[PDB]
Design an enzyme around this catalytic site. Structure first.
Site, PDB file in Angstrom:
ATOM      1  N   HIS A  34      -0.811   8.266  -2.736  1.00 47.37           N
ATOM      2  CA  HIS A  34      -2.077   8.805  -2.184  1.00 47.37           C
ATOM      3  C   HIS A  34      -2.497  10.073  -2.957  1.00 47.37           C
ATOM      4  CE1 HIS A  34      -2.347   5.951   1.090  1.00 47.37           C
ATOM      5  NE2 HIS A  34      -1.379   6.454   1.843  1.00 47.37           N
ATOM      6  N   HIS A  38       5.321   6.767  -1.529  1.00 47.43           N
ATOM      7  CA  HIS A  38       4.050   6.322  -0.909  1.00 47.43           C
ATOM      8  C   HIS A  38       3.019   7.477  -0.932  1.00 47.43           C
ATOM      9  CE1 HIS A  38       1.704   3.921   2.078  1.00 47.43           C
ATOM     10  NE2 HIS A  38       1.353   5.148   2.518  1.00 47.43           N
ATOM     11  N   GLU A  39       3.439   8.631  -0.427  1.00 47.26           N
ATOM     12  CA  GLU A  39       2.498   9.758  -0.224  1.00 47.26           C
ATOM     13  C   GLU A  39       1.979  10.249  -1.565  1.00 47.26           C
ATOM     14  OE1 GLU A  39       2.723   8.878   3.579  1.00 47.26           O
ATOM     15  OE2 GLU A  39       1.181  10.044   2.602  1.00 47.26           O
ATOM     16  N   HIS A  99      -3.624   1.961   0.261  1.00 48.53           N
ATOM     17  CA  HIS A  99      -2.817   0.826   0.757  1.00 48.53           C
ATOM     18  C   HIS A  99      -3.203  -0.435  -0.021  1.00 48.53           C
ATOM     19  CE1 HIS A  99      -2.269   3.455   4.620  1.00 48.53           C
ATOM     20  NE2 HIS A  99      -1.586   3.906   3.506  1.00 48.53           N
TER      21      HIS A  99
END
Ligand SMILES: O=C(Cn1cccc(O)c1=O)NCCc1c[nH]c2ccccc12
Ligand SMILES: [Ca+2]
Ligand SMILES: [Ca+2]
Ligand SMILES: [Ca+2]
Ligand SMILES: [Zn+2]
Ligand SMILES: [Zn+2]
Length: 159
Positions: free
Chosen positions: A118, A114-115, A124
């Site tokens: 980013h 996930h990170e 998202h």
């Protein structure tokens, strides 16, 4: 499109290691999280042991020098800055969490997927199957796959 790395060869360095896990498990979890994104883009990730890296991986707690203090056990687990110099790209993991290789505490590999999304410029997703969905969900790391939306999102940024 938000910020993107203006190169396909991207370095990372692990600043420090959570005591929650074996060091080699941290290296493996992070390496495999970069590989998830490597597999669906033209991006190549090089680990550096010392010196300047695009993506710095940090475990820290509370107020940890950016304007985005962590919040203790639970709530926010991690964050990351979109592509840019300095703190740009860097991914921070809340050391008040219990980081694991498995379904207990907070699975580092899944959180790092996930990170790093980013760190590469994704926001998202509204798709609950997407790794870029805002909330942590344990899924069997053997069976793990990016959803179709995660792939669409990263390929709209790179290639
Ligand atoms: O830190 C968070 C947001 N968050 C806030 C309050 C309570 C939570 O359980 C929670 O996940 N998001 C970044 C981690 C994350 C977000 N989506 C994910 C999907 C798979 C694995 C990890 C993640
Ligand atoms: Ca950086
Ligand atoms: Ca927290
Ligand atoms: Ca911890
Ligand atoms: Zn931070
Ligand atoms: Zn997020």
């Amino acid at each position: 499109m938000g910020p993107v790395w203006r190169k396909h060869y991207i370095t990372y360095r692990i600043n420090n290691y959570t005591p929650d896990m074996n060091r080699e498990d941290v290296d493996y979890a992070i390496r495999k999280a970069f590989q998830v994104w490597s597999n669906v883009t033209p991006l190549k990730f090089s680990k550096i042991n010392t010196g300047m890296a695009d993506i710095l991986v940090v475990f820290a707690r509370g107020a940890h020098g950016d304007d985005h203090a962590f919040d203790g056990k639970g709530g926010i687990l991690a964050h990351a800055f979109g592509p840019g110099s300095g703190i740009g790209g860097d991914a921070h993991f809340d050391e008040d969490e219990f980081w694991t290789t498995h379904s207990g505490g907070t699975n580092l590999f899944l959180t790092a997927v996930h990170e790093i999304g980013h760190s590469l410029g994704l926001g998202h997703s509204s798709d609950p199957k997407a790794v870029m969905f805002p909330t942590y969900k344990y899924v069997d790391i053997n069976t793990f796959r990016l959803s179709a939306d995660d792939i669409r999102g990263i390929q709209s940024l790179y290639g």
